[PDB]
């Protein structure tokens, strides 16, 4: 609980709480009774009593009894079914016989898991959508804010803050595409009985799965997937990529907050938001190892791999929604310090503009000749500890082709941004 | 090398060998010169000399010099560019000036990586396609081969071998869908220069990227992605799911090969193919942790995360193609032992048919009554160590509703398969 | 909470609960005030008021306020210090000035972490000690219980159950050695102030650390270790090995519980204990990836890596203590089914004794000759579907050297156990 | 091969090459024949022929045949034994019968693995020893070089470069202790035969293992450990900690190389060494997940887990030795830029000395009063954009207790280093 505030996101944590989990299991049991009554497998009468008794089962369920019983049964569904049955019995000893009719523990657990995933995906998707919108808007606001591009953590050539923001925006848009593309394949119901054959429903199996899926508004699958878990992993893999995208952003803005750089700051000096996001960017990759090992499952119901999913999947959702929430706060209240950006550009005293000077000279001199005059000027500028502009401006060959004013233009960071504006426009359009 | 034969797949290993990597880099340099000549940035003359000198550069390149130089430069592209330039020079000192014009090391390395991924994906996709076809065909051949379904490694209720095969087939089909769905987003070119601004190409940047993408037949992206790596991770994540699917299959067939079960065997008694596949199902999840940590990259070119990708991505492809190749061999030459399957069904002496007997009795007796007669019969059958059929057949209540012949039918494994045939038909149709 | 019962161990979970964590932080603050009063840095008077106010601070602390404040400060220590100070103030506005004198957040957090580790290690060590004792005792009880040894999951040659138990016992003993060997190096105090220089204590720093360590009965280190985390990883690495040892045991006993093998059973048929232990054996390796990435920490206090430890370390302890607790239950109430063991030995109808027959014949025949008679007999026995003893006993060359009674001895599983009894005695002695 | 130069270390890579592996296997076979001849199990004559034929077997072995055969057998030992036998046969058809007498594949593979580990550990230990020596020497050289301590990547209070170096030195010393402490437990021989019972050696088993261990100068274990793998994991876990220690150092020196900080540089501006070390600090944690999953092994010889070790263990050694080698180069030729260190200390214009000013005033004013005068001065200094010294020096209360010269002393970074010199001396002594 003390850490929930630091790393997770309140709504996604609630969706995965013990109380919500049991709520979703109740929902799965109700849909099952309804789907069966609707096709004749059980009397409409029983379904109605179950549907009504359910509305308050959550308040009548003993969570201490449930936890203790879980350790002995090996899963929550078994003791949960006992309790729900006893609850429906105290309302009609007869409807009680139809509670959990034909299902096995994993049907209810996997279905509640998919119901949880459906709801937490909606929240995560909306967070990504706001992050995208906000990054696009800031990219536009600062598309002309010049600053240094850094490679291997060393100043290299100028870029604009808007270009970093456009790069992040486009990454969020690819995440939005990934989320939409997996929904149909992944949000499906689970109902197959003990060995996934629906044997106790005899020849009514396919009819009942179809109506069960429909009641919950989930997809239906061709065959039971108690042992094939690609759908679970697939959902985790997309959350993993989203966490990696904001992890990269948090690495960048906290580096820009170093005392000696101070170009961008987290809204109100410690980078508290970066610390949480970077912790999630450490933890999610480790949880991915786990969710992938969980694919190796024995026959019709695994020993170990399936149990591990109950611990890893929720943690991945919670860290991702938590990391997205802190990233949004930062993208919205981000403080840009234009003076420090200008100052850090002056750090190498014009040496970073060397190649720009060389390109301006190439036409009137031949690239070989241009390269040679600039390299000798850099040596001189370093020996005299002067700005490269001061040295190049007193070189004869050069005065032959450029006035002082043309030289001042050649040395402006803005004059060497290549096609950065085309790239920013290109990402503003894919929107 | 000795292990390559055990875990990898020959063609995918070649695509990622030092020699192929340098080949793809050469290909990237040629496309760059051609795209530039085609839009005016460099003389068509130079492009033609480079394109021709390239055809044999691979044979002229010194790989020992290259490896030694790589350790000092920090990447292969830098010493590779020197060498290729020297090679083009000995053919025309003038065309040599245009080699690697405007690109930075990462453009050539990421582009060669995507070219490699394109080729290895084609091979992996074709392996999945054959695995799918073969699983569908075997599923049909054995849709009626009865055997025990096992949960928590304990016999539970009958299923058919064809149902396990249909479950695997449908998993392969979802993999085929995943592979097709990422191609457009992932197989794109990389050309952005030092800080991804294409500054040295000035206002010709967007025009050149477009023609470079086209020359290589790759997609073009809105902005440079030197630091945003979701496309790399995404490709690894799909390979990871495929390896998890065959890992699950290898766990199953090797369990079916245990001396005491002996229901299915690897083609010619050790499960050599399972050992390799299960090793890949251990290694790939670990490599996933690595590829996901690699998303956290500093600014415009990372220190560490990017270097790690060069080691992990190829290993994931190689283990996946290797695991697919051994799985295909097994799916094709799989030996089914129907007698052992029949025998293991007799293992509990009819106790696994208890619920089937109870369902047959429910109508003529009321489920409560049916449950009670069957439970007392199980106790008796265990006490007398007799087959449950022998005990139930001499119970009065029962003889009242069933002749010996109807009892023999109720006890046949085939009579309690629920909707397994509908599920097998459903997966044969999605095809 | 519902899952705590399934995977963790009650006492270790309490040591890592929010309430115990704050308790240990209080303990760290008290020791600090006492150590300082004892060397003159603060008045003995203040230390006494703090020590007394502390006895009930836990009941006066607002945990909701604390959680909310934590999300904003980035760690629990900061809001905790405010609260504890306010608590000491309402008892003496003057002693309150000396609360948390000279320490930084990480000193209190790392010290409370080591106090927690000290207490959970004592519990884990005692669990390993009982597992060791129990395995040694069972090894002795069944040192002569013959059963099949299995390689690549295939029957190979006879072993005894006692030999598997001795192998597990010796592994537990190496764990006991590992635990004892790291205590001195790992259970040390943390007190270094903001940048680990104890600057606000001026020239009293070393004197105060020495007395602080002593008050808590922890080791003292030569230099501050806010950024060097090998001690944390080292503790996790040993817990990781212990979880791997019981993971291996759970894989084995659940395989022995398969319906068709049924040689050993979990005490009261699903392997519920194996499912939990195997889930921990999936999760701990993934958490190890995380704890190892956490070593890469920036300068004097990291951004991300340190925060991640707060989530991973406790989970590793909790899963290990949980896995040990279920393993102990199984080692103590383990049900051995000697008849099934005897029966599975008869599974290949004497074929597994082929090499034993060959060794008995080698002396009177020459190994070449012995190998050739046995191989032809195996072919015949398989063709006639007879026990190998029936075939070999009617082979002339053979009757020439052995009576029927000597042949019956050569075919007893017990006669081909090599030095298994020496190995079991050897592990009973290292005890 | 091209990457070997970037990430690994030449000698450790050779120890794990195919050629060295087969060399060590030959060595294991020779020791086995010798140990057996020495106790009577095989004729001294055969042992001598094998020992002599071995001296050149490596040159006679067909590596292509070996690789092809390996993929079919499932391990290298099987086809290797065939070849070595054929080699010994062409020298004496009789000695050939005793090649690999009584051993199983895993005995030779695990023994060659431990022989490799023994040799690579010697190299890694020596690298750590040199890193330790060099760090201690540099710590001494710069114990007085003042620079900023940084927390959460923000300047905090002064420290000395020597203190960072002492912290690293002490971490290397704990690694030296860890390496020495595991040798006895981990460097042991493996000889147990098919199911670890040495059944084919009958009652000579224990005698032969003892002499086999002795011939190779390895420890002997109480029982066979084909399935218990804690010794392998333990070796990987220590290499993992070493890689994490230099990973932390590489993060620090590359941050100190940022253009705007420029306090320390890699010897000859890109941090090429940091890039490799940080890639190993990403990859090793992932490989740890794998080596830990490999503990879960089936019965007497696993399917999958054991095979995976052949790929992970060597990679961990190679990355660790590679990371150590680059770290040593940097520790030895490290360039310290004292002026930039001095300059970055002036970055906040005295604000970082605020607490030092407050401690100097506390005695003559009361901590409350001191805190209040300093906080108002910081506000003023920020409003006027002046150095805090300029503001505090014109505050009356203050002039009352300090002359200008005493104020200049209070503001020197060196005057607020707490017990850093005691810590540096403490680590120089543990040496």
Swiss-Prot record, chains A, B, C, D:
It comes from the Bacteria. InterPro entries: AdenyloSucc_lyase_C (IPR019468), Fumarase/histidase_N (IPR024083), Fumarate_lyase_CS (IPR020557), Fumarate_lyase_fam (IPR000362), Fumarate_lyase_N (IPR022761), L-Aspartase-like (IPR008948), Protocat_PcaB-like (IPR012789). Homotetramer. Pathway: Aromatic compound metabolism; beta-ketoadipate pathway; 5-oxo-4,5-dihydro-2-furylacetate from 3-carboxy-cis,cis-muconate: step 1/2. Gene3D superfamilies: Fumarase/aspartase (C-terminal domain), Fumarase/aspartase (Central domain), Fumarase/aspartase (N-terminal domain). GO terms for molecular function: 3-carboxy-cis,cis-muconate cycloisomerase activity; lyase activity. Keywords: Aromatic hydrocarbons catabolism, Isomerase. It catalyses: 2-(carboxymethyl)-5-oxo-2,5-dihydro-2-furoate = 3-carboxy-cis,cis-muconate + H(+). This is 3-carboxy-cis,cis-muconate cycloisomerase. The keyword Repeat does not apply. PANTHER family: ADENYLOSUCCINATE LYASE, ADENYLOSUCCINATE LYASE C-TERMINAL DOMAIN-CONTAINING PROTEIN. It is an enzyme of class 5 (isomerase). It comes from Acinetobacter baylyi (strain ATCC 33305 / BD413 / ADP1). GO terms for biological process: 3,4-dihydroxybenzoate catabolic process; beta-ketoadipate pathway. Its EC number is 5.5.1.2. The keyword Isomerase applies. Belongs to the class-II fumarase/aspartase family. Catalyzes an anti cycloisomerization.
């Amino acid at each position: 609980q003390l850490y929930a505030s630091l790393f997770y996101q309140r709504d996604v944590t609630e969706i995965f709480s013990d109380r919500a989990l049991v709520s979703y299991m109740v929902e799965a049991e109700v849909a099952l009774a309804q789907a069966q009554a609707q096709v004749g497998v059980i009397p409409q009468s029983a379904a109605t009593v179950i549907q009504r008794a359910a509305k308050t089962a959550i308040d009548k369920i003993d969570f201490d009894a449930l936890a203790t019983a879980t350790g002995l049964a090996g899963n929550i569904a078994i003791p949960f079914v006992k309790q729900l049955t006893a609850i429906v019995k105290d309302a009609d000893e007869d409807a009680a016989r139809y509670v959990h009719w034909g299902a096995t523990s994993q049907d209810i657990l996997d279905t509640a898991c998919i119901l949880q995933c459906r709801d937490a995906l909606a929240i995560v998707q909306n967070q990504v959508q706001q992050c995208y919108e906000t990054a696009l808007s800031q990219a536009q606001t600062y598309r002309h804010q010049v600053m240094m591009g850094r490679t291997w953590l060393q100043q290299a050539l100028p870029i604009t803050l808007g270009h970093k923001l456009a790069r992040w925006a486009s990454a969020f848009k690819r995440d939005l595409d990934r989320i939409n593309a997996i929904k149909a394949r992944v949000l499906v119901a689970q109902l197959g009985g003990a060995v996934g054959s629906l044997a106790s429903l005899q020849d009514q199996g396919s009819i009942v799965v179809e109506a069960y899926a429909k009641q919950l508004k989930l997809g239906q699958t061709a065959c039971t997937w108690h042992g094939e878990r690609d759908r679970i992993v697939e959902i985790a893999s997309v959350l993993g990529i989203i966490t990696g995208n904001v992890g990269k952003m948090a690495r960048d803005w906290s580096l820009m907050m170093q005392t000696e750089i101070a170009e961008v700051f987290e809204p109100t000096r410690n980078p508290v938001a970066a610390a949480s996001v970077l912790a999630a960017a450490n933890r999610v990759p480790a949880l991915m190892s786990s969710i992938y090992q969980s694919m190796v499952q024995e026959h019709e119901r695994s020993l170990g791999a399936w149990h591990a999913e109950w611990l890893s999947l929720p943690e991945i959702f919670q860290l991702t929604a938590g990391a997205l929430e802190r990233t949004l706060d930062v993208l919205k209240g981000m403080e840009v310090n234009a003076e420090n950006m200008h100052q850090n550009i002056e750090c190498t005293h014009g040496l970073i503009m060397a190649e720009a000077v060389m390109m301006a000279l190439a036409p009137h001199m031949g690239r070989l000749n241009a390269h040679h005059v600039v390299e000798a000027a850099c040596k001189t500028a370093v020996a005299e500890q002067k700005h490269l502009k001061d040295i190049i401006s007193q070189v004869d060959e050069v005065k032959q082709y450029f006035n002082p004013s043309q030289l001042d233009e050649i040395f402006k960071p803005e004059s060497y941004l290549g096609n950065i504006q085309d790239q920013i426009d290109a990402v503003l359009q894919e929107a």
